[PDB]
Amino acid sequence: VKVKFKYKGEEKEVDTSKIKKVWRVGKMVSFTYDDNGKTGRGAVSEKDAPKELLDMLARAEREKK
DNA sequence: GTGATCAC
DNA sequence: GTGATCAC
Numbered sequence: 001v002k003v004k005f006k007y008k009g010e011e012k013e014v015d016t017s018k019i020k021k022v023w024r025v026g027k028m029v030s031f032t033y034d035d036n037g038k039t040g041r042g043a044v045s046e047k048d049a050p051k052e053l054l055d056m057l058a059r060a061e062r063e064k065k
Numbered sequence: 066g067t068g069a070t071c072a073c
Numbered sequence: 074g075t076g077a078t079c080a081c
Contacts, residue, residue, distance in 0.1 A: 006078095024068080025081095026066085026068090028068095029080090032069075039071070041069085045080060
């Protein structure tokens, strides 16, 4: 599935399969991605986040340490 | 300010 | 070792 986001301003969308790290900053979801390139970075509202990313956040919220 | 990061 | 980013 895809998440569309703001960083800079050229608009963006990314397959959740290409998302390295996910975490919560306040009521915002922040993540890093890419592979062929640099580590891309993005964030979206925690309300308007696609269930999949939230699944990934939940995954990251239980990781030990 | 908040996490985590990149990019300088 | 600090600013710039991101949604509030």
